[PDB]
A = this chain, B = another copy of it.
């Protein structure tokens, strides 16, 4: 508790440095048709022509990702549940509160940009997406970080890397289908995530230095709970298994898979020097061995899962007018 107050100066010098000043930040308008341009109408027209060459399954993944981004208020609330770092007034001048608010401000651009791209595309049912967003924010999320900044920051380090990987992959696909402007959208959001992930990972690195036992134990606890996706409760008013189905599509398309999850786990183990730690408590060594260790186990389970996998299985999605895509 006092550790985070004692780390305030450190955070100003080591965490806040990863924020881009508002003056130097990209904005959604940089990547959208310019509504004051004499060419606005043509720019929208061109966006729509490019979108016609993008298949439905990519739009399912892109919409799921946009909906996740749009639930931002949920995520700021999560960070603000964490003892030691939470903003106690809404304007607290602590390094930690300044970070939460500025991170949230950067994140807000992601949902904005993807929303308007999707709106202009004409390839998706915006009303059904809007319904899904309302259900999602109403449902919240249950990632089990409790009131722990250890859990919160470990979870966020993991999940920002996951979204970085997802967006980079989505950019690659956008470029594949001939849509450079959508590739740039995904690339810009991905660059935010790389930076955010680096910042959160740095915080946990410092915590591991000051208290290796508490940190490794929290890492193991989070991994046992599993890194639950932020929009795990998504629902559109018709598909009670919407998240499972969206996730299946995202996997098949190569945007995000169980193997990426394993890669992130092993990345963080390395970055926090978890395998190389020594002089831990009995509980600490148990946690160390568990996380070390978990990666290869999940990778083998995934390999066996792929081995026994039967043929999917096409599914309607309200987001694309009940048109069907392969699971």
- Cβ of A135 within 8 Å of any chain B Cβ, yes or no, is yes
Mark contacts of A289-323 with chain B using CB atoms, 8 A cut-off: 1 yes-contact digit, 0 otherwise: 00000000000000000000000000000000100
The reply to whether B134 and A105 form a contact with Cβ atoms under 8 Å apart is yes
Known: A76-B73, A130-B27, A137-B108. A142 touches B101 (CB 8 A): no
- Cβ of A121 within 8 Å of any chain B Cβ, yes or no, is yes
This chain: copies in complex? 2
The reply to whether B41 and A41 form a contact with Cβ atoms under 8 Å apart is yes
The reply to whether B81 and A87 form a contact with Cβ atoms under 8 Å apart is yes
Known: A22-B237, A23-B237, A109-B130. A101 touches B40 (CB 8 A): no
A146→B89 CA distance, assembly (Å): 6
Mark contacts of A234-267 with chain B using CB atoms, 8 A cut-off: 1 yes-contact digit, 0 otherwise: 0001000000000000000000000000000000
The reply to whether A120 and B35 form a contact with Cβ atoms under 8 Å apart is yes
Known: A91-B139, A120-B35, A130-B112. A104 touches B73 (CB 8 A): yes
- Cβ of A221 within 8 Å of any chain B Cβ, yes or no, is no
A156→B91 CA distance, assembly (Å): 18
Min C-beta distance of A142 to chain B, whole Å: 4
- Cβ of A179 within 8 Å of any chain B Cβ, yes or no, is no
Tell me the interface secondary structure of chain A in the complex.
helix
The reply to whether A138 and B90 form a contact with Cβ atoms under 8 Å apart is no
- Among A35, A86, A133, A143, the one with the most B-chain Cβ atoms within 10 Å of its Cβ is A35
A27→B132 CA distance, assembly (Å): 11
Query: Which residues of chain B are within 8 angstroms of A106 by Cβ–Cβ distance?
Result: 134
Interface size class of A (residues with CB under 8 A): 35 or more
The reply to whether B137 and A105 form a contact with Cβ atoms under 8 Å apart is yes
Known: A28-B126, A76-B73, A126-B28. A22 touches B131 (CB 8 A): yes
The reply to whether B142 and A35 form a contact with Cβ atoms under 8 Å apart is no
- Cβ of A72 within 8 Å of any chain B Cβ, yes or no, is yes
Query: Which residues of chain B are within 8 angstroms of A55 by Cβ–Cβ distance?
Result: none
- Cβ of A9 within 8 Å of any chain B Cβ, yes or no, is no
- Among A73, A89, A126, A135, the one with the most B-chain Cβ atoms within 10 Å of its Cβ is A73
The reply to whether A126 and B29 form a contact with Cβ atoms under 8 Å apart is yes
- Cβ of A193 within 8 Å of any chain B Cβ, yes or no, is no
Residues in A76-115 with C-beta less than 8 Å from chain B:
76-78, 80-81, 86-92, 97-98, 101-102, 104-106, 108-109, 112, 115
List 14 A-B residue pairs with CB atoms under 8 Å apart, sorted by A's residue number.
A25-B131, A27-B127, A32-B126, A35-B120, A35-B122, A41-B45, A73-B104, A74-B101, A80-B81, A81-B87, A87-B140, A90-B142, A101-B139, A104-B138
Nearest 4 A/B pairs, CB to CB:
A105-B137, A27-B130, A91-B142, A91-B140
A residues near B (Cβ < 8 Å) are: 22-23, 25, 27-30, 32, 35-36, 40-41, 44-45, 70, 72-78, 80-81, 86-92, 97-98, 101-102, 104-106, 108-109, 112, 115-116, 119-122, 125-127, 130-131, 133-144, 146-147, 233, 237, 321
